[model samples]
Target: MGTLEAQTQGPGSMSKTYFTQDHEWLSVEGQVVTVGITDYAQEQLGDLVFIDLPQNGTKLSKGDAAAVVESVKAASDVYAPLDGEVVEINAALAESPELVNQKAETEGWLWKMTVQDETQLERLLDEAAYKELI
Candidate 1:
């Protein structure tokens, strides 16, 4: 399991991580961006109960709602960090919502998107910058 704390920080305060005001986090590696909920989001939602994910190969645009996360108290939408095709969805989440609570950064990753435009990543929040936002 990847530490939730590490996920919250982005790659570094200097480069490569972007965040959505909606609380979704994006880690860019080449043209692929890994997306997940931020630790602050999980903490705010309390216990997770269900996850609604898109099918692999689905096309998405930046700002589009790509998934849904249901918690014990509220439901939230997970947005795309950039325009892209959904390459994968976290199947484990269907069987284990607790995994999110345990490891939101690594094993708890919700999906992988193959970005159509790398420049879009520049619009996201950096680690140190996002730390202040949350």
Candidate 2:
């Protein structure tokens, strides 16, 4: 029984995940990208109070301010890590802003982008490179 769980989420499962010095992370599959603030960024924000997500079909270039995250103490903007068009937002955040603090990397994703140029991903940092930045 445990073996089945292991197989599905084991070592060979490599996500095309990358990071930016701005504290955003992106996971790529095909031409689509899922974007979120890094765990470290969430920790810096203290307890999250709200998030204002971009609308669907919004176009963004790398380094653009894509969203705003507010904590009990302060509010900050989340930047786009790559050039793309936003396709979706995490609806759960509308009801529960705390999700970013709870699961920043996984269930707390901020949005999905339809990236036209996968080559732009090369400019972002990989997991190992990103860890050194923090």
Total backbone clashes of model 1?
Answer: 1
Task: Highest lDDT: give the candidate number.
Answer: 2
Q: Write the per-residue lDDT of candidate 2 for residues 87-109, one digit (tens) a residue.
A: 99999999999999999988999
lDDT of 1 by residue, 1-134 (tens): 12233334455523244556667777756556689988778888788999899899999987788888889788888887678899988889999987777777667889998865544444333333333222
Q: After superposition, how far is residue 86 of candidate 2 from its true place, in Å?
A: 0.2
Candidate 2 TM-score, true structure as reference:
0.81
Model 1 TM-score, all chains together: 0.76
* Model 2 regions lying over 4 Å from their true place: 1-13, 125-134
Residue 59 of model 2 has an lDDT of 95
Clashes of each: 1, 0
lDDT of 2: 0.79
TM-scores of the candidates are 0.76, 0.81
